[PDB]
C-alpha cells in the first residue's frame, strides 16, 4: 500500500473522521480560504450573494466567527432557533475540513461559482481494524477513546500522518491505517489504541 501524507482535519470518532491530502491540494485549499475570506469580508461583496431560499444540500459560503475565516459549506439541516423565531439555525458541513457547525443565516452567503472549482478537500474515513471497547450495545466509542484518538492524530493542528487505505465499508467509505512519522514508535495508531486499551481488534 502506497503511503499517503495526510492531515486529520476533523474527528467525530475513530470510526468517523476526516483527512486532507498533503500536497498541491493543501496549498490550493489555503489559497482558496484566503481569497474567500478577503472577498466575503466586504459588505458590498456579500450584498451580491444574499442567501435567499436556502435548501438542504446547497453549497454556500459561511464565516466561522471565532476564527473570522470564510469556508465552503453544505447545508445539512435547517433548524428552528429556540431563542429567536426570526432566524433559523443552519447545520453546515464544512466540506474542506469535515467539522459540522450550527451557524446563523446572518453568517452565510451564496457561493461565487468559481469557488466550486477545487475538489472538496475533507475525505471521510474510518480507522481500520478496530472496534469499540464496549460490547454491550448500541455502541459508540467511549469519550476517552475519542479523546485518545484526537490526541494521537493531533486533529486540526497540522500534524502530518502517513496513511494507507486497507479496506472499505458501506460509494465506499475508506478504512485506513495511520502512522505518525514524528513520534518515536513503530506502532501505528490502531495498534497504539489497542495495546493501551482504548480499542479492541477485529
UniProtKB/Swiss-Prot annotation:
Shown chain mapped onto the complete sequence: 259 to 474 of 576
Record text on subunit structure and interactions: Interacts (via C-terminus) with AGO3 (via the N-terminal region when symmetrically methylated on arginine residues); this interaction is RNA-independent and may be required for AGO3 localization to the nuage. Interacts (via Tudor domain) with piwi (via N-terminus). Interacts with tral and me31B.
Family the entry assigns: Belongs to the Tdrkh family.
Taxonomic classification: Eukaryota, Metazoa, Ecdysozoa, Arthropoda, Hexapoda
Protein name: Tudor and KH domain-containing protein homolog
Effect of gene knockout: RNAi-mediated knockdown does not produce a visible phenotype. However, fertility is reduced with egg-laying decreased by 30%. AGO3 protein levels are decreased and AGO3 is delocalized from the nuage. No effect on nuage morphology and no mislocalization of piwi and aub. RNAi-mediated knockdown in germline tissues results in delocalization of AGO3 from the nuage.
Phenotypic consequence of residue 30 to A: No effect on binding to piwi
The Tudor domain, residue ranges: 53-118
Substitution effect: residue 99 to A: Decreased binding to unmethylated piwi
Tissues where the protein occurs: Ovaries (at protein level). Expressed in the ovary and testis.
